[PDB]
């Protein structure tokens, strides 16, 4: 009996966060 | 009996964080 | 009986953090 | 008995790019 | 008895890039 | 008895790059 259970789990996340705040006056 | 359980778990995360704040006046 | 349990766990994280604050006046 | 022949040679040339540019308040 | 032949030679040329540029308040 | 032949020679030329540049308040 031949059993080839080929189940790859790919949970790799490629994230890119950016925030620009210009001239805060209070 | 041949059992080849090929299950790679890939949880590698490539992150890039940046924040720019210009001229804070209070 | 042949059992080849090929299960690599990849949790390697490549991070890059940066923050720029210009001219703070109070 | 079971004889298994596997020639597993993957060629992965995949490129994942995450480009981001933040621009706030520009004067001229 | 089970005889197994595996020739596992992966060629991984994959390139993951995370470029980020933060720019705030520019005067001219 | 089970005879196993494995020729596991991985060629990993993968390049992971995390470039970041922070720029705040520029005058001219």
Residue numbers in the entry:
A (entry chain E), B (entry chain D), C (entry chain F): 274, 306 to 330
D (entry chain B), E (entry chain A), F (entry chain C): 272 to 274, 306 to 330
Paper passage:
The ordered assembly of tau protein into amyloid filaments defines a number of neurodegenerative diseases, also known as tauopathies; they are the most common proteinopathies of the human nervous system. The physiological function of tau is to promote the assembly, and possibly stability, of microtubules. Here, we used cryo-EM to determine the structures of heparin-induced filaments assembled from recombinant full-length 4R tau (2N4R, 441 amino acid isoform) and the corresponding 3R isoform (2N3R, 410 amino acid isoform) to resolutions sufficient for de novo atomic modelling. Our results show that heparin-induced 2N4R filaments consist of a mixture of at least four different conformations, whereas heparin-induced 2N3R filaments mainly adopt a single conformation.
